[PDB]
Amino acid sequence: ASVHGTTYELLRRQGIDTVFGNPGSNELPFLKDFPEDFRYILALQEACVVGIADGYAQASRKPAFINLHSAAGTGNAMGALSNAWNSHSPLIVTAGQQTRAMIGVEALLTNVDAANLPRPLVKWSYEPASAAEVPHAMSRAIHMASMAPQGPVYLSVPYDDWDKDADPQSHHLFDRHVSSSVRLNDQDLDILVKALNSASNPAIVLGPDVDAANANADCVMLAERLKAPVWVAPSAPRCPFPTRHPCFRGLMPAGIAAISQLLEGHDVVLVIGAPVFRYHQYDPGQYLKPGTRLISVTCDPLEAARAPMGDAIVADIGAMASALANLVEESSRQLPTAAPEPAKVDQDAGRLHPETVFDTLNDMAPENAIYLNESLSTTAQMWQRLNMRNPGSYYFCAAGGLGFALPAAIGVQLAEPERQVIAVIGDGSANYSISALWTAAQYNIPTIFVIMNNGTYGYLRWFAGVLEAENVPGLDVPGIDFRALAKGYGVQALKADNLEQLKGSLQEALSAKGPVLIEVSTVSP
Amino acid sequence: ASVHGTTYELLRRQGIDTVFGNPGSNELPFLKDFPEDFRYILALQEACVVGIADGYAQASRKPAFINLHSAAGTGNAMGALSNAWNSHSPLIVTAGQQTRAMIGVEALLTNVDAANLPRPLVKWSYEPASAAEVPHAMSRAIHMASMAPQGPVYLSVPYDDWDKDADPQSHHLFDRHVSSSVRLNDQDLDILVKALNSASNPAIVLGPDVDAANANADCVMLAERLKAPVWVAPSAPRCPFPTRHPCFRGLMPAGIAAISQLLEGHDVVLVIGAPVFRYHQYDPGQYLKPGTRLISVTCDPLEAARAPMGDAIVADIGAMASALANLVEESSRQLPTAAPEPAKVDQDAGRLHPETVFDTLNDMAPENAIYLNESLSTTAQMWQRLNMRNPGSYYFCAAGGLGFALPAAIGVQLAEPERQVIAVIGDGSANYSISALWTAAQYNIPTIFVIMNNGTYGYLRWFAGVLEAENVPGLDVPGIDFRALAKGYGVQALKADNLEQLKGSLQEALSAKGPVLIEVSTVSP
Amino acid sequence: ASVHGTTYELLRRQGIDTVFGNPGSNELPFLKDFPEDFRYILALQEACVVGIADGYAQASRKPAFINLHSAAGTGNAMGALSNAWNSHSPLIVTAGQQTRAMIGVEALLTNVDAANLPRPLVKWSYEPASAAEVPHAMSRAIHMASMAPQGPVYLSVPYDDWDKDADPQSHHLFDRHVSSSVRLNDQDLDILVKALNSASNPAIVLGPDVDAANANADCVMLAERLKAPVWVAPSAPRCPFPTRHPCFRGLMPAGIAAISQLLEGHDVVLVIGAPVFRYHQYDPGQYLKPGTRLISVTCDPLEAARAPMGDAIVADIGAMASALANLVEESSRQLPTAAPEPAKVDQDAGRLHPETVFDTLNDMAPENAIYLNESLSTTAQMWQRLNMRNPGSYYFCAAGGLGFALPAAIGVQLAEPERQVIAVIGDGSANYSISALWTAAQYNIPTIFVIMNNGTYGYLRWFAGVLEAENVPGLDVPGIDFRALAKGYGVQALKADNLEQLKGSLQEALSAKGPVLIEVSTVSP
Ligand SMILES: Cc1ncc(Cn2c(C)c(CCOP(=O)(O)OP(=O)(O)O)sc2=O)c(N)n1
Ligand SMILES: Cc1ncc(Cn2c(C)c(CCOP(=O)(O)OP(=O)(O)O)sc2=O)c(N)n1
Ligand SMILES: Cc1ncc(Cn2c(C)c(CCOP(=O)(O)OP(=O)(O)O)sc2=O)c(N)n1
Ligand SMILES: [Ca+2]
Ligand SMILES: [Ca+2]
Ligand SMILES: [Ca+2]
């Protein structure tokens, strides 16, 4: 067997059947004789390739495979990799290297010092020392991406390796099963359960690793047994809980003082599947108020190490959530009462308030819609106004890197063909990965893109307020016609300048058989 | 003084007056109270920001200053940095970091392990240990970018540093002059000159550092004195010689065997301002034939170290070219005869042959036009068909990273307001940095973009041929309307489906007062 | 509170009370006002400092704290760190940095790019962005070293930070409890147990993480229930099983073919707490023979990823060994029969055969002796001839880095004051960290050092044989008087030129109240 044949066999034996890519000369020997059972999804720029693969991996809850071109293709993807690192996305990033005979002279499109290029945004980064090692290196990449805490990995392969003879002993790689599905030992788990059972006013805080683990239903059971309010940890990349469940209390503000104030009076705060905490704005104060102690369950040693307070347990979130949900007592406290519905904001016949847009989306979208958020100044309103009952219903750029939601929405829609994906993206954010629209058109992936057009980088005007910063350049983005951009890439385009048009446009988009972009004229901040 | 005030003073004292940027919250304290004498050029995605700054630095022959947002903004620019590394572009890349009080907890948009992120594509990468150190760190960044061999550098600055008190001793940074304008000592330079004077059939090979140094006219004088043919080193990022001068012999093929064959019979080959050599395709053979010896003058130790043959001198290209041009004897050999004009390719009333497009550009463009090339399958024809008499007339992605030419053309046009810039970009390449069009519209930078639309990644179909690779996915890019993309970003758009329309469109574009995009329907490969 | 006071409070609250160090100017502000409840152990060179701390951490099964001087002190320790990485030793390495005001100018003993210096041999490496962050960074270092898989970490601290005011919120760091004491979920653990219960001829292979976890007794119970032979994985850094238990089968040869041959006919091979596998010599063949399947339990994702065969479970070794030992059925197969005693090698009245030395050590040493091995050509004989009944009885350089055993023996003896430590070290190996002897003398740590003096690098003469390499320089080390070296550092010294003298010397050493070095004249290979 060749290294080519062996490597594709390893990939299919490990469940991988799709390559998200933008091709180059160093990858042609890998992509040639492309196997019939695989599919290749082309995107026109590498931030888009990785974004699509990332949405696909997060929604499918399995690794996604990426093929990029040498240093320039990998470099174009590095902002996308920053998000993937923070969302623990299991991404296997492969990049083609020059032929081994011309690496030394640094021929054009040699990836120099290749393994160092994507650091520090990958769990593992490597170039094999010989062609016969390639399948073993690929095996390492698959398992490193897939073991808790999941994350992106990088493998650089000289293009001449693929046609070489594989090692016959590589067959032992094909069926390896590697598990990190672990939970706290019985004695210490009993101690934790007793602390939860004994708490007089527990609170629960959930992060993205709950949704990645599909631990959402177990966390519902846990919250109901403990009769405890549930918050989502700040800067949330996913939604880990039904947002209209009686225990749900919403997204935490991303500030130190704000969070300790919210938790005040809670004696035990159990955090599951989140960093402690992904603050954003600087809001100095107490990490916790007196009387509050914190216990964190995290799949990531790096999270447990850097928490500035609390105890921590490093374990699989699925296994831990299930064990806790099944072991805790039913408290005799009263179940928390559901948060009230949000108020209707006054809306005239002109430009749309974001609140109106979210209320209308909530009124019209299917109950199993999946949303993406890259409309940064409207996040709080989005979380208050969209009823998201099911797991996998929300994605937001985990490292704050714009250019995620547009391509990720396409990968999510590819992963979940029977759930309507609706990406809500600001006019500024829409440009970072605009060319991803083309992939939705070409493969007819029927994502709906709602562009919130207010002409400005609104969130940065806000943060300028908290910093009290005046005379800042570069905050306005006038003069972009998103319907023309959508036409340019073959996506049906609609405009909504008022509520009547928003309703009509959503009705058309929801009914459409292909992707649709709706440009919404929203109010300026 | 504050760190803010001191740093802008240092920048203006060192000749920097423009910030190319895409802003974020960590940069607001740097960008606030933006100085009246500076200008900020916004681009909508960071590959575009760096591309624009890169074209501006290469054309202006001075450092360009960039401000990006933390890890995600830096990561989005890393493909652009790969080109900048290979073209020795003096780029000062600054990125905002979280406030020092929240770096430890890794708050959202903390740039973790920041200095390692852009490696290995920068000469120097750093985050200062205190706010008062920021001006000195900026001084280091300016000089590291600007000293031979020039190249990109990276500085990460926590956002709280700007408002802190500066060290009063920072004033000693303001007027530092640092020179690398050096040449080989007299005794060894005399030995080199004697070897050139004694050669029976010398050849000259020139690379991009000649054009960066504006050493072109000196290299003309050198070639005329030595009566020597002149080639451009392969994978050329710039044009270092007038392409219709009698000595000019064109762009070398990027292959080992091809180059040794071309040089056969030349006893001394003097290479100036190029790597030896930037091969691309694998074309194994002799590095040089018997009877040929090579001498390389390079500004870059890394180039001198990795050459697989020849002697080398590491020195400033401007200083060396001037010294050699003035010291060599006038040979009594006959001057080389000019290459013949290229033939006219048969052209019917349908889709355009690339040869026709270049002939027509050469017929209509001003004599001081500046071209950019990201139409990878037509490079040989472009070099044969465009008469480029003047320095600074050609740019091509130095690391082969697509997404350079579109934004770089805007930076070049900003640097050279009286020279018409014409970027010739393939339909595939146009997408990587498509959003850069917006910056040309907003600032009315009148670049002309000629999109060569053949529906496919043509060069990759070629390289597939040399590799003999069949059943490769992802090579076609149908279904993109570039006039709609240009409209989307506010750029006037024209279509050329045949020669009559190409001529009309060029006439309109040349006359236009703003940027113009022409979509040309070219023949499929 | 100051950063100094807060950091020592954090260290004592986290169980750390000893600093192993070699001091320098950047560390004086940390070491001043040294707390009364701490102890400082000086060694004269940094390989010795880290070796001592490493032996102390491995034997105590808890993190050890190290303080080195800037880049030069850290660099002198990097070979020692290579061993620590491979043995998963929880080492907190701190190094002093220049004052923040002189880092930029790179004053003498600035640690440039400090965090990158010890990579890739540390789990985490960091320099804080401000003085107030130091206690949180130290908290991160403690937990990163201590979480599974344990390993060395690095923290660089500017010397001016210690006197600065601490953040009052740092108190939340003091009592953090972080656990990685996890095991496979119940459903999958039941599947594993069923596979073990069903095996017709299981084998067990144990590595160093079993002894680190004190999982030895549980592994005895497991082997007895399964009636299974037990081997120690190759290149063994520790001893995980009583070597005269009936199931024990010895140390595996460090070769691919040798191991698959040894395992042939075993249907299920359970590996616990080892890489799969730490081969040394190149011995190509099948990784496993047909009919053998492998299951690995490892605390280290990097081990699970790179195994070339088998399934793997990433979990705590203590928790997994206990669960398996208590859950498996008692097999009705016959218990394995103990290996026979090794034969007595013929010994005349001259130089000692290594076999004689080990037999004599086994005859005279206490049953709870602890041995270290850095006599590389005699390892097989050592493993056959020393009855090691108890956990923590054997250490060998985990990365093969010489200079470990001499200082580690001192740290082990410091950790286990009531167990006689006997380090058996070749004459070549003894020199790498010879100055460590001084620390044993000064603190009266009564380690016994047995120098096996055959005048040559014996193992390298062997490996030269397997490679069939002739005319190799640098293999002989004549002319070293180890009794004089011991005298030089204040350690009692004895010589053993024959068996009578070996017996007398051991009797004296065993009775001595201080450290003793015995130079043994052994036979040449
Ligand atoms: C890759 C990248 N570049 C720059 C930023 C900085 N940034 C920028 C530029 C924002 C403006 C977003 O504008 P929008 O139109 O998409 O949405 P809003 O108007 O609601 O803010 S929010 C933010 O953090 C970023 N986060 N990521
Ligand atoms: C960032 C990046 N991604 C991928 C490539 C690989 N690549 C690709 C995708 C090419 C196709 C260029 O297509 P085009 O339409 O712009 O021009 P041609 O049709 O003349 O080839 S040429 C080439 O090297 C690259 N060089 N850089
Ligand atoms: C730091 C370091 N340097 C060099 C070596 C190479 N090396 C060397 C030099 C050996 C000779 C050991 O000689 P010895 O006298 O201690 O023992 P033997 O005679 O039994 O081999 S074994 C070995 O791997 C090493 N392992 N570690
Ligand atoms: Ca906006
Ligand atoms: Ca094309
Ligand atoms: Ca020896």
Ligand code: NA
């Ligand atoms: Na990097």
